[PDB]
Every structure is written in structure tokens, then in C-alpha cells.
RNA sequence: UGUCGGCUCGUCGCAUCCUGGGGCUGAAGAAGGUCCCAAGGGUUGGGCUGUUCGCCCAUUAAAGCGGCACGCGAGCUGGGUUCAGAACGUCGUGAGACAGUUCGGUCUCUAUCCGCCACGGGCGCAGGAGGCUUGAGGGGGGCUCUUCCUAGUACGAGAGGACCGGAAGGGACGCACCUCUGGUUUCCCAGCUGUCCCUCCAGGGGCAUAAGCUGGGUAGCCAUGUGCGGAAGGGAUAACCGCUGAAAGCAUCUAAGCGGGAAGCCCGCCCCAAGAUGAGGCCUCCCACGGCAGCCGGUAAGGACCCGGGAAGACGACCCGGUGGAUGGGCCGGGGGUGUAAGCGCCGCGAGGCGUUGAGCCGACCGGUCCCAAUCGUCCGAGGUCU
RNA sequence: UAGCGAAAUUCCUUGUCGGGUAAGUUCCGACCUGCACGAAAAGCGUAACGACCGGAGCGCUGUCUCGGCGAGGGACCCGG
């Protein structure tokens, strides 16, 4: 290995342009059948501790 | 699986008792010789005032090899030691005798004296 | 040109005049013909099979409709036979009789991302004598300031795997209709379960 | 290529991983419910259940068996005393493992609870 | 589908039923079909069998025997229609399932170290007695 | 602009080493000699020496010659040579000197751009969709030997020995595969040592490696193992050989015209491929929703998110499944590996042995079973431009 | 001069002969036409010693034919 290094400033156009996919994705929420607070799916709800129809867990 | 380095035990009375290859005798190019292969291979050891002496550059036909050798009927066959005859350019065996078992794969490549000499076929 | 679908089982050996012969078991039939494709109305011949029934919940409305059309049973797979024309609407294993030569279409073994020993069997370099962190690294790739560049198509490493492969020319050991089974002498691509289609040989 | 290899390495090696579970068993087994990581609790079910069910079979083979495992007597003793007997007409699945909803801060961990049926 | 439940479908026409159990460890004659020229023969093959591997119908066992001084081993395959008959000689207890090590102990070691199998011997003889 | 040689990886030229097709021969046959066409594929292993080269050994159809910064050190090597040490021969009064010989002597983790191998995201292909496809254009592949029958015939004094046609068997190479053969198999089983511990006996656990050591070993991944490929065939030709035939009453393969003729070219075979923006074709599905070729909003066919997963996989992509369900985990059966568990009885003063017992344990493989876990759901998504 | 010599020196040079090897520009033993050894910048030998530098053999090996599988720490994905 010689050291490999960069050849030239990039272009703001070009930087920009990689991070073109770095966009974040906002989560994925539904509303629990309990308390109807937005919850991701298949977790238990944090605000009503249900899941299944049923308490597993103190909130 | 012989090649190029390989020690054999002659399993004839010629008077040599290990050589080793240097060529398989099986194309321009072949990479191992199994039973039935014809290989050059210099004379190592040999006892004295025997047919041929350490140092003669003889043919041989392997007998029998520590790898195993496949056959159609969908069994194999595996010996201890690998081990040639001595023969010359007309598939003849030099020596008067053989010991130890051959393997029958010879009888097919055209050895039929060796396989006569032998005391067992296997 | 006979062809049909079908799905490799396993690998196994029979013993045919005292000899082993090696089998692949493949369970082909039974296929039905859903469309033909024919040269006034699309160009060329060939025939449309279906293989594996579906449940229908599974099953969305477009292709419903098309195997209605048909009026065939849903099917999880359809796959084409080109130049081909059975008389009948539902292809067997009984096609093909023994001792009849075949090829066989599936998807191989996917190796994922592989080193360029494993894909192009390449020598790699020495395990000692110096040799300094590229006991698999595939050497030089080119020349140098002519060309000044890399040759298209140049063997390198990368995905190896997952592929269309054909092998052609195996003996059709036999022919089990009453389980659809089809023994074919030798190897097949893809593992057990995977989806291949067999058909009649190209080589006299 | 992994095809058809089963279980997880959890990024330690054999008696590190053989401790894990272990020590994961007896946390279970005596507190009833633990919160864990998601692919540590998925990997639990197969130890805790073989164990909660040799602890069904009941016999000495059975206990020396899980007390290569759990060592402490006196849990096992408890799992044949108390634990067994409420799974007597269930086959398998005696345990359980739900998602948490809430990630950890330190690194992101996704948690999850898994507990003793019923 | 049951896919090995296939493959045994396949293999039921060959599996053969007709030759006695044994072991690793007993000294057994295997008299096997051989073509040479321009017949068809029986060559005996008698010896311990040092390994049986198991697959069902693609199950093979290996034998070794000193033949003139050269220690030589045969594999077969359990269902192979060239095996005629095969006859336990000698009942041997083996502490291992894989018998390898008697390519190295001389013919004095290999008879201390595999002994006569006076269990199964008795049981030999407890059947063989037809009415 | 790192200078020899090597290794890895190739690609090209043809003044062709071999394989193919020819003419002439001081070509009887077999075998050679010479020139013509041909770059498709192929062109071995080893001894010497840093060597390239060359010589040699054993084979071979053959062991071709060259270009690519005497191809290739941000790919490796560092033996040669070309820093500092030391010595020999020789030169110099000497400091030192020769490339003359000799022993030794730091080769730099992170790839921005082009390029190359793989792989996604976006948009477009005028309505939006689920499938199935054509193949423009690409790549891959392209090798060869032995024996036998013809026939010991044609030919030759004899040795020796065919064309043409017809079988069988190899070497290397390529693609796939795991039935067999053979490996691995990180905890699947058993044995063994030392020490510490639970609990004293028994029975067990930790550590001696990131398996403590040994004897084995499933599925998987694998070659040494197995299957299969090179073609067949068609078309146009190269050298070359003709038919018919003038110019030129003869003659001429040519000026008109027509045949025969290569491992070479085009198709044929396998693989990629409609970003082929020239954005193809076919089957089927949804539909004229409200307000103001455009915009906003709820839908349809459908799709994505999430979840259980997968011989699929770096991620993402792909493919399967989501209680209307066998996807994973558990459990049961079978396979399979290990090879007679603990306990008790019996024998022995004892180490141990026997019986219970092919026992006990037991990952991945082929199955069964709702016991557990894929609960509950949400967001996108056509109103079809103009001649 | 003694002694030594194709040598840690020999250009021609892989000198020639012999030994070892199937094959040996290296190695060992010889000859002497010493380009250009030679006697305290010592000459020729020397038991023992050497992480020094040559040559050959036995053993044993993934150095190799020729690669394959497995383990762990990175590399890969997410959070800081
Ligand atoms: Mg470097
Ligand atoms: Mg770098
Ligand atoms: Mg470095
Ligand atoms: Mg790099
Ligand atoms: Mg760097
Ligand atoms: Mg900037
Ligand atoms: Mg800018
Ligand atoms: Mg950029
Ligand atoms: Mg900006
Ligand atoms: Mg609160
Ligand atoms: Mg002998
Ligand atoms: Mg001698
Ligand atoms: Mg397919
Ligand atoms: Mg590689
Ligand atoms: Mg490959
Ligand atoms: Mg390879
Ligand atoms: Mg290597
Ligand atoms: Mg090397
Ligand atoms: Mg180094
Ligand atoms: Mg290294
Ligand atoms: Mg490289
Ligand atoms: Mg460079
Ligand atoms: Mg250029
Ligand atoms: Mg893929
Ligand atoms: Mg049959
Ligand atoms: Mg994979
Ligand atoms: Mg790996
Ligand atoms: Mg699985
Ligand atoms: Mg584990
Ligand atoms: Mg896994
Ligand atoms: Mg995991
Ligand atoms: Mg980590
Ligand atoms: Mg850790
Ligand atoms: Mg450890
Ligand atoms: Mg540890
Ligand atoms: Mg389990
Ligand atoms: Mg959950
Ligand atoms: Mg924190
Ligand atoms: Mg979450
Ligand atoms: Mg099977
Ligand atoms: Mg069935
Ligand atoms: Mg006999
Ligand atoms: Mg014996
Ligand atoms: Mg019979
Ligand atoms: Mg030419
Ligand atoms: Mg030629
Ligand atoms: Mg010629
Ligand atoms: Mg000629
Ligand atoms: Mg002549
Ligand atoms: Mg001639
Ligand atoms: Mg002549
Ligand atoms: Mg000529
Ligand atoms: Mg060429
Ligand atoms: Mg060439
Ligand atoms: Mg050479
Ligand atoms: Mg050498
Ligand atoms: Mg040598
Ligand atoms: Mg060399
Ligand atoms: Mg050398
Ligand atoms: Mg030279
Ligand atoms: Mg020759
Ligand atoms: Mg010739
Ligand atoms: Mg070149
Ligand atoms: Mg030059
Ligand atoms: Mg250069
Ligand atoms: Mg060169
Ligand atoms: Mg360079
Ligand atoms: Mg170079
Ligand atoms: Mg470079
Ligand atoms: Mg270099
Ligand atoms: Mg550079
Ligand atoms: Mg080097
Ligand atoms: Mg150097
Ligand atoms: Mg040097
Ligand atoms: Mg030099
Ligand atoms: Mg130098
Ligand atoms: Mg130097
Ligand atoms: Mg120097
Ligand atoms: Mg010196
Ligand atoms: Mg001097
Ligand atoms: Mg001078
Ligand atoms: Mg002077
Ligand atoms: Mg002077
Ligand atoms: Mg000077
Ligand atoms: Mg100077
Ligand atoms: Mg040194
Ligand atoms: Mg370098
Ligand atoms: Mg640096
Ligand atoms: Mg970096
Ligand atoms: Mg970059
Ligand atoms: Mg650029
Ligand atoms: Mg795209
Ligand atoms: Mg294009
Ligand atoms: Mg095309
Ligand atoms: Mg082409
Ligand atoms: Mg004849
Ligand atoms: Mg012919
Ligand atoms: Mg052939
Ligand atoms: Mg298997
Ligand atoms: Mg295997
Ligand atoms: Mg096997
Ligand atoms: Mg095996
Ligand atoms: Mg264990
Ligand atoms: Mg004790
Ligand atoms: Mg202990
Ligand atoms: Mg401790
Ligand atoms: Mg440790
Ligand atoms: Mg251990
Ligand atoms: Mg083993
Ligand atoms: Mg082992
Ligand atoms: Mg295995
Ligand atoms: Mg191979
Ligand atoms: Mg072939
Ligand atoms: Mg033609
Ligand atoms: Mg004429
Ligand atoms: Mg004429
Ligand atoms: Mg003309
Ligand atoms: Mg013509
Ligand atoms: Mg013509
Ligand atoms: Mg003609
Ligand atoms: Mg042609
Ligand atoms: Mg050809
Ligand atoms: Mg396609
Ligand atoms: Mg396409
Ligand atoms: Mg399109
Ligand atoms: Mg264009
Ligand atoms: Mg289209
Ligand atoms: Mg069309
Ligand atoms: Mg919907
Ligand atoms: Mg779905
Ligand atoms: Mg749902
Ligand atoms: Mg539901
Ligand atoms: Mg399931
Ligand atoms: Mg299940
Ligand atoms: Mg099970
Ligand atoms: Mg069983
Ligand atoms: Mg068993
Ligand atoms: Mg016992
Ligand atoms: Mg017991
Ligand atoms: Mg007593
Ligand atoms: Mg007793
Ligand atoms: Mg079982
Ligand atoms: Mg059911
Ligand atoms: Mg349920
Ligand atoms: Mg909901
Ligand atoms: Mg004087
Ligand atoms: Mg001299
Ligand atoms: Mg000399
Ligand atoms: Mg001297
Ligand atoms: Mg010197
Ligand atoms: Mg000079
Ligand atoms: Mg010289
Ligand atoms: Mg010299
Ligand atoms: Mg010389
Ligand atoms: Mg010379
Ligand atoms: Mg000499
Ligand atoms: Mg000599
Ligand atoms: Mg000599
Ligand atoms: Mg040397
Ligand atoms: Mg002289
Ligand atoms: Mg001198
Ligand atoms: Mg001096
Ligand atoms: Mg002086
Ligand atoms: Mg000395
Ligand atoms: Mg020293
Ligand atoms: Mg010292
Ligand atoms: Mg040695
Ligand atoms: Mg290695
Ligand atoms: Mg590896
Ligand atoms: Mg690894
Ligand atoms: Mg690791
Ligand atoms: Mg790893
Ligand atoms: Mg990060
Ligand atoms: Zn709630």
C-alpha cells in the first residue's frame, strides 16, 4: 500500500449528490386498540402496558 | 493416487525394493496414476547382484495404492502400501515372481502375466 | 420438443446390471396448460404450464382471472415450454420413457459474495515465502499506461450463485407415474426443493 | 455461506456463549419474566424449554441432567417442585418472548421480555 | 410432499433384508460376485470390519484382512445385489464405533485388544436352534 | 516516470510449435523436406543457476517467437543489482578505488476521479396494475491423444505399413452436484490428565485456546469423488482443385456464369439482455371519484411499511409465510452420530468386571403437531394529453 | 623458497576429470595456463565451539501438487 489519497476537493454538487440516500425514514406507529396511542406495531404498548388484548405489563 | 516423488515397493523379484516416480506415463499431462498406470521411476534401493541396480531408470505398473480405488459395482478397494512391478516396453513383467495381491483393475489394462503370477487377485 | 416442470427431491444411487448408477429424483408431473402461445397471436410457439396448486386466498385477482380463462385450478408456479404442443391439456412424467436423453434447467446454490479462488479458481498467492497479506488476492489486473485501463469482462470477485444453469444430456434412468417421479442419471442444479424444468435433449 | 446452520454466535465463543445461556436460565427460572435483547431472548427458548421439560420427566436422570446446567440445587429443586407440575398437560412452548417498545439509549438495542407461560 | 418419504419410495424396490446383523469388530466372509474373463464367479472376503456408515439404504461397511503379508480393506454396500451371503465368523467387542487404530497394532495387540464378544457369541447360539 | 528475475492475472500480434486445409517433392507405403491458408483452442513436470536465456532428465500432438513503461512492486516477493558493516584479488605512498568476487543489510493500515467486478435507490417506458414473454445486441465455449475394426489389405524385394470409412478408451480444461469415495464439522457423543468447586461417597460443573488433550462424527460447505459439455449440422469462404468458356480458330478455373474446399468466419449450443429512451409483444385485473395534458383530496386493481423466516443474502435486493396459518422456536416420530448413562443387583481385599442395556444422551437432516411466537394494523395507490 | 591453488582470490569459466543426482552454472575430491595465492596487512593444518556462510541425506510436514472446511478479532448493518 502507497498511501491512496484524494485527487481533488469535491465539489459541494458532489457530495451532495452521495449523500442523496441519507434521508432518514420516519418510524412506523399505529394506535394501540386500548389507548389508541401511537405505538410501533407488534411491540407492547409503552402507554397502557396491553398487548394481545391483555395486561403483561405495568406502565 | 502416484505422482512425481512417490515412493512404490517393487513386489517383484528383480532385485529392487523401493523406487520412485518421476513421470506418469498416461498423456501429455496427467496429474496422478492409480492402478494399472504405466510410470518411469529411478530404482532407489535394490538388494545386490540383482537384475537391475540403485539408479536405473526403469517402467513400472502400479499393483495396488494406499488411496482407494472405485469400481463400477459401487464398492472400492484400498491396500497399504503402493506398490509397482517392473516391466518392459512390451508390457512384459522383467522379473520371474510376484508377491502380495494385485488388483483386478489389471486384468483389464492388459497385464494378464502379472496377474497370472499373482497369489491373489483382489 | 418435449419439456415440463417439476421440483428436485434428493439425491440418491440404484443399481442397474450390477452397476451403481447415480439419481437425482425430480417430482414433475402433473403440469396443466393454461395459454399457448401461438404465431398468429403472439409471435412464436410454445405452451404455458402451471405447477403446484395454490389456495386461492393466496391468490390476487389478475392471475385468478387468467387461470380462469383457462379454466384451471390456481397454481403457484407457470413457467413456458418454447416449440412445444401437447395434444392434450395436462402434461405427465409420461413424456418421457427410459433411456431417453434430457437437460435440466434450475437455479444453482447461491454462494453470495465470493472470493476469486472460489469463483474462477484462481491460484492465489503463497501461504509463506514472504508472502505479505494476499494469500487469496488475485494479483496484477492490468498492464500499465497502455491500455491504462481494466478489460470488460475481467474475472474479479463478486456474487456466485443464484444462477440460470442448463445441464444437458441425462439419461432418463426411469419413469414412476404413479408418484409423477422422474429418475434422472446424474447431477441437477439447485438444492432439494428448488424448481427446475425438464426437457427433451439438444444433442444428437 | 451459512445454508441450513442453526443457531446464533452472539458474537462470543463456545463456553461464552455456553454461559450466557446458562446464567440467562437461572435468571429466568427464578424471576419468572427477564427483559433481554430480541436475539438473545429468541436464542433462551430452546435451553429453558429442554430444561422445563427433563424438569417434567421428573426423575434422578433428569435432575443431574438440568443440574449440569443450573447448579444451584435449590433451583432445582424449585423447578421440579414448583415450576413442572403447572406444565404437566402442555407439550413445548413453555416459554414466551414479546417486543419491547422503546429501544435502548446506549446503543440502540432492541429489548424484549420473555417469561414463563401460564 | 414429503421428500424422504420419496427417496425411501425410490430406494424400497433395492433394500435387501436377507443378511444377518453384526457389528464393528466381528470377522465376517462376504461372498461377493466378481467378473473377470470370461465368467462370473464368487470371491470370499473375510476379515473385521473396522466401520459401518449409515444412510439408510446408502449404508456401507469396510473390511480388513492381512492377505500375504499386505494389509488390504474392501468397502460394500449394505444392499448391493453382488453380495451373495455374508457369514459371521467371530462376535468382537469394541469399546468404538470406528476402528482405525488396527492399522497400527500388531496381530498380538489386535487380539488383546479386541476380545471375543462372549454376550453376542451366547446369543448366536441361543438362536440357531430351529424346531 | 521504483530499473533485473520471480509469482499472480491476463490480453494482443502472426514471421504457426501443435492441432486443421492445401501445392511441389530427389512424394512407392509409412515417415519427412519445402512453400501456401489458418491466431479457434492448446503448448507438460523436474535437476542446475538470482538469473532472463541456456544446458540436462522424463514425457509430449506440441513443448512457438514476440508486443503490452524489456505487460503487471498504491497486487505480492526482494534472490540479482544499486547506501552505510566486513573481507579477498587487483590498483593507489595514502584517504580510498573496480562491479571484479564474497557474507549481511527497514519495500508506506484508510481509493476522491476514471476503469473493473458485483449490487441497490430514483426516474422514465401517457391511465394505473399482476403475471408471462420476444431477442436487437452481448459474453461463454471452441483442445487433443491412444487403441481397435477396415487390413497386416493398397503399396514394397524385404523390413515396414495407409488413404476413406467405423467403434472404444484416455489427458488436461469447463459447468454443476453431494448418491458413493474422501475431508471439515467450536460442543453432537465418548474417553483421559492436573487442579478448584457443588456435597462427603457417588455423580457432576469450570479452567488448562480464541474446542485442555485424545477417539469419532450429522446437515452444510467441499475435491481427491460423481454427472455433463467441446459437438452434430447448416451457410458463406481462405490457400488450393475443378466445370463450362471467350478475348486470342489453339489454350486458359474467369473476362459472363457454375461447382468442390479448413480446428478458421456466420448461424447452431449455454448464459445476460427492451435504459433496445427504437424503452417491444401477449394473458388478465381495476375504472369514466369529488372540489378548483395542472392542482388538492378520498378510493379501485394492487403495492409498500411491520412481523415469522429462507441452501437468498455484506446492507439493501430476492423468495416464502403472517392464526383463512406449519414460517421460525418448542414438543413428538424417523434418520443419524456417539457406543452399553445414572441407579440398583451380583463377583472381586482392590483397580475393576458382569447384568439391567445397542443403554443413555443427542445441532443443522425428512416429517408430524397450534404448545409458544408471526397480535392489532397503517401509509401509498388510476379519473387516462393532442393530430 | 616451503606450503597452497578455478580458491571468501580464476577474466576466458558452467576450464577439464572424478564423486553425488533420473538430470547438479551450486557442493565435495582432483589436475595447475595462479588474468591477478604465498609465508606475522603471516603461510598451511587443527579437536572443541558458532542464532555466521555453503552442499547432501533420514525423519516429518498445507512449503507444494491444490486447494477445502472450521474457530475467533476486524471488515458488513444499527445506535454513540
Ligand atoms: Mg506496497
Ligand atoms: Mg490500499
Ligand atoms: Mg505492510
Ligand atoms: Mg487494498
Ligand atoms: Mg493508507
Ligand atoms: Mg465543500
Ligand atoms: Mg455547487
Ligand atoms: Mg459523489
Ligand atoms: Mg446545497
Ligand atoms: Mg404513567
Ligand atoms: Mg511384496
Ligand atoms: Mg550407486
Ligand atoms: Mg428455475
Ligand atoms: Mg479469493
Ligand atoms: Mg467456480
Ligand atoms: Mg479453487
Ligand atoms: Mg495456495
Ligand atoms: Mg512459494
Ligand atoms: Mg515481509
Ligand atoms: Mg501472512
Ligand atoms: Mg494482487
Ligand atoms: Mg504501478
Ligand atoms: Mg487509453
Ligand atoms: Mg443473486
Ligand atoms: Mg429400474
Ligand atoms: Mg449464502
Ligand atoms: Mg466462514
Ligand atoms: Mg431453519
Ligand atoms: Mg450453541
Ligand atoms: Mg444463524
Ligand atoms: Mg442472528
Ligand atoms: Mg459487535
Ligand atoms: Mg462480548
Ligand atoms: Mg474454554
Ligand atoms: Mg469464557
Ligand atoms: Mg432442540
Ligand atoms: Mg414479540
Ligand atoms: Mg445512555
Ligand atoms: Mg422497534
Ligand atoms: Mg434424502
Ligand atoms: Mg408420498
Ligand atoms: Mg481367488
Ligand atoms: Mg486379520
Ligand atoms: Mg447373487
Ligand atoms: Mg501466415
Ligand atoms: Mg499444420
Ligand atoms: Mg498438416
Ligand atoms: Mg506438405
Ligand atoms: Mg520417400
Ligand atoms: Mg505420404
Ligand atoms: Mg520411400
Ligand atoms: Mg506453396
Ligand atoms: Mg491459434
Ligand atoms: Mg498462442
Ligand atoms: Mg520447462
Ligand atoms: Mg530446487
Ligand atoms: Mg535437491
Ligand atoms: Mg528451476
Ligand atoms: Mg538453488
Ligand atoms: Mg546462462
Ligand atoms: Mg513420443
Ligand atoms: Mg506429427
Ligand atoms: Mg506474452
Ligand atoms: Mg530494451
Ligand atoms: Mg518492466
Ligand atoms: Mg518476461
Ligand atoms: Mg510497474
Ligand atoms: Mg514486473
Ligand atoms: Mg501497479
Ligand atoms: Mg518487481
Ligand atoms: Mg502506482
Ligand atoms: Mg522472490
Ligand atoms: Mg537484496
Ligand atoms: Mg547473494
Ligand atoms: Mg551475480
Ligand atoms: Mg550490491
Ligand atoms: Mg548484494
Ligand atoms: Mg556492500
Ligand atoms: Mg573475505
Ligand atoms: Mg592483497
Ligand atoms: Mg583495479
Ligand atoms: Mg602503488
Ligand atoms: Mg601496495
Ligand atoms: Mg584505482
Ligand atoms: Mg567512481
Ligand atoms: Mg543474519
Ligand atoms: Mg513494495
Ligand atoms: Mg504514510
Ligand atoms: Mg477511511
Ligand atoms: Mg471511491
Ligand atoms: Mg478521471
Ligand atoms: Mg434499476
Ligand atoms: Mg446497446
Ligand atoms: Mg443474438
Ligand atoms: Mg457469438
Ligand atoms: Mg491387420
Ligand atoms: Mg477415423
Ligand atoms: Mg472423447
Ligand atoms: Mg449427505
Ligand atoms: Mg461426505
Ligand atoms: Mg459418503
Ligand atoms: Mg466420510
Ligand atoms: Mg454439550
Ligand atoms: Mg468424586
Ligand atoms: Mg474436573
Ligand atoms: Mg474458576
Ligand atoms: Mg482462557
Ligand atoms: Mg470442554
Ligand atoms: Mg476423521
Ligand atoms: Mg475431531
Ligand atoms: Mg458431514
Ligand atoms: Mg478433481
Ligand atoms: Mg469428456
Ligand atoms: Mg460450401
Ligand atoms: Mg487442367
Ligand atoms: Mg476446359
Ligand atoms: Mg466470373
Ligand atoms: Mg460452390
Ligand atoms: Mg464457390
Ligand atoms: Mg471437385
Ligand atoms: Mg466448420
Ligand atoms: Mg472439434
Ligand atoms: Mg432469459
Ligand atoms: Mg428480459
Ligand atoms: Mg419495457
Ligand atoms: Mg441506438
Ligand atoms: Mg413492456
Ligand atoms: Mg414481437
Ligand atoms: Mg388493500
Ligand atoms: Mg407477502
Ligand atoms: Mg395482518
Ligand atoms: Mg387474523
Ligand atoms: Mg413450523
Ligand atoms: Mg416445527
Ligand atoms: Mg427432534
Ligand atoms: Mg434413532
Ligand atoms: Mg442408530
Ligand atoms: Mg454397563
Ligand atoms: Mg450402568
Ligand atoms: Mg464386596
Ligand atoms: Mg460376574
Ligand atoms: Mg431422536
Ligand atoms: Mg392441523
Ligand atoms: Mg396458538
Ligand atoms: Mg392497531
Ligand atoms: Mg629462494
Ligand atoms: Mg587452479
Ligand atoms: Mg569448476
Ligand atoms: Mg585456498
Ligand atoms: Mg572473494
Ligand atoms: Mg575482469
Ligand atoms: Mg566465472
Ligand atoms: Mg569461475
Ligand atoms: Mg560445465
Ligand atoms: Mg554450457
Ligand atoms: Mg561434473
Ligand atoms: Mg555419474
Ligand atoms: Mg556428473
Ligand atoms: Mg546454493
Ligand atoms: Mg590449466
Ligand atoms: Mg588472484
Ligand atoms: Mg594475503
Ligand atoms: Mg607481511
Ligand atoms: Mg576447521
Ligand atoms: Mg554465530
Ligand atoms: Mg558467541
Ligand atoms: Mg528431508
Ligand atoms: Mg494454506
Ligand atoms: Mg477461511
Ligand atoms: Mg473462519
Ligand atoms: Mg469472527
Ligand atoms: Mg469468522
Ligand atoms: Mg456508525
Ligand atoms: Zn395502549
Known sequence: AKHPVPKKKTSKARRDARRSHHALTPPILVPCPECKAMKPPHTVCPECGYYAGRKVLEV | ?122 | ?204 | ?118 | ?131
Open chain 5, 1 to 131: 410432499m414429503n421428500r424422504g418419504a420419496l427417496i425411501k419410495l425410490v430406494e424400497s424396490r433395492y433394500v435387501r433384508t436377507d443378511l444377518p446383523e453384526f457389528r464393528p469388530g466381528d470377522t465376517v466372509r462376504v461372498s461377493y460376485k466378481v467378473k473377470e474373463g470370461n465368467r462370473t464367479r464368487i470371491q470370499d472376503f473375510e476379515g473385521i470390519v473396522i466401520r459401518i456408515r449409515r444412510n439408510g439404504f446408502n449404508t456401507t461397511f469396510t473390511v480388513r484382512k492381512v492377505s500375504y503379508g499386505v494389509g488390504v480393506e474392501r468397502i460394500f454396500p449394505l444392499h448391493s445385489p453382488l453380495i451373495q451371503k455374508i457369514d459371521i465368523v467371530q462376535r468382537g467387542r469394541a469399546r468404538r464405533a470406528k476402528l482405525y487404530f488396527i492399522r497400527n497394532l500388531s496381530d498380538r495387540e489386535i487380539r488383546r485388544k479386541l476380545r471375543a464378544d462372549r454376550k453376542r457369541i451366547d446369543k448366536d447360539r441361543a438362536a440357531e436352534r430351529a424346531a
Open chain 4, 1 to 118: 455461506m451459512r445454508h441450513l446452520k442453526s443457531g446464533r454466535k452472539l458474537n462470543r465463543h463456545s463456553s461464552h456463549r455456553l454461559a450466557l445461556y446458562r446464567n440467562q436460565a437461572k435468571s429466568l427460572l427464578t424471576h419468572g419474566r427477564i427483559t433481554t435483547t430480541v436475539p438473545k431472548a429468541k436464542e433462551l427458548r430452546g435451553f429453558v424449554d429442554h430444561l422445563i421439560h427433563l424438569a417434567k420427566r421428573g426423575d434422578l436422570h433428569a435432575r443431574r441432567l438440568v443440574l449440569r446446567d443450573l447448579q444451584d440445587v435449590k433451583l432445582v429443586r424449585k423447578l421440579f417442585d414448583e415450576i413442572a407440575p403447572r406444565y404437566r398437560d402442555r407439550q413445548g412452548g413453555y416459554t414466551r418472548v414479546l417486543k419491547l417498545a422503546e429501544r435502548r439509549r446506549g446503543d440502540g438495542a432492541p429489548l424484549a421480555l420473555v417469561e414463563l407461560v401460564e
Open chain 3, 1 to 204: 420438443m418435449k419439456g415440463i416442470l417439476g421440483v428436485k427431491v434428493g439425491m440418491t444411487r440404484i443399481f442397474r446390471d450390477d452397476r451403481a448408477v447415480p439419481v437425482t429424483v425430480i417430482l414433475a408431473g402433473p403440469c396443466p396448460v393454461v395459454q399457448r402461445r401461438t404465431p398468429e397471436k403472439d409471435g412464436y410457439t410454445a405452451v404455458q404450464l402451471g405447477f403446484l396448486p395454490q389456495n386461492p386466498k393466496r391468490v390476487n385477482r389478475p392471475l385468478k382471472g387468467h387461470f380462469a380463462k383457462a379454466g384451471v385450478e390456481p397454481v403457484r408456479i407457470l413457467r413456458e415450454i418454447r416449440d412445444f404442443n401437447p395434444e392434450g391439456d395436462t402434461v405427465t412424467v409420461e413424456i418421457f420413457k427410459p433411456g431417453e436423453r434430457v437437460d435440466v434447467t434450475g437455479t444453482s446454490k447461491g454462494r453470495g459474495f465470493a472470493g476469486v479462488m472460489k469463483r474462477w479458481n484462481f491460484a492465489g498467492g503463497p501461504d509463506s515465502h514472504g508472502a505479505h497479506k494476499i494469500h487469496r488476492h488475485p494479483g496484477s489486473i492490468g498492464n500499465r499506461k497502455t491500455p491504462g485501463r481494466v478489460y470488460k469482462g475481467k474475472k474479479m470477485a463478486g456474487h456466485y450463485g443464484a444462477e440460470r444453469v442448463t445441464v444437458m444430456n441425462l439419461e432418463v434412468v426411469d419413469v414412476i407415474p404413479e408418484e409423477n417421479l422422474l429418475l434422472v442419471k446424474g447431477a441437477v442444479p439447485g438444492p432439494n426443493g428448488g424448481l427446475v424444468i425438464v426437457r427433451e435433449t439438444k444433442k444428437a
Open chain 2, 1 to 122: 493416487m502416484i505422482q512425481p516423488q512417490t515412493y512404490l515397493e517393487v513386489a517383484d523379484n528383480t532385485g529392487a525394493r523401493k523406487i520412485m516416480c518421476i513421470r506418469v506415463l498416461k498423456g501429455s499431462n496427467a496429474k496422478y496414476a492409480t492402478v494399472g498406470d504405466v510410470i518411469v521411476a529411478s530404482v532407489k534401493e535394490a538388494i545386490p547382484r540383482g537384475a537391475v541396480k540403485e539408479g536405473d531408470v526403469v517402467k513400472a505398473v502400479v499393483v495396488r495404492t494406499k488411496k482407494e480405488v472405485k469400481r463400477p459395482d459401487g464398492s472400492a478397494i484400498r491396500f497399504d502400501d503402493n506398490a509397482a512391478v517392473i516391466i518392459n516396453n512390451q508390457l512384459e513383467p522383467r522379473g520371474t515372481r510376484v508377491f502380495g495381491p494385485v488388483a483386478r483393475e489389471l486384468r483389464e489394462k492388459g497385464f494378464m502375466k502379472i496377474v497370472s503370477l499373482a497369489p491373489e487377485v483382489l
